[PDB]
């Protein structure tokens, strides 16, 4: 559909769609300045996503957005890198879940 967010390598294996984009704010209380991490702004955020195999375990490692896990996730079809599971540390943050995928690596 035109809504739909596939894999750029294997075209036919939707990730995520449209519909399931928001905006993460990135700042914490009072919208402080933050010293940039990783690289968001190639960065995609979804609240759902599918066709996307998990990798490991959750890690807190060098995390691109503070207060989130990471988790590797790739494609199910071709296994290609399309981002991460982000899963929250404290039980009072919203959403719980989220995706970061990577822009370059989805058609559109
Ligand atoms: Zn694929």
Redesign the pocket.
Known sequence: GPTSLC?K??QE?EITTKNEIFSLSLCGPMAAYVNPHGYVHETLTVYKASNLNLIGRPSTVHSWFPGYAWTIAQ?K??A?HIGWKFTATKKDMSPQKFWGLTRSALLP
């Open positions: 894999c390598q294997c294996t494609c079809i071709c290609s």
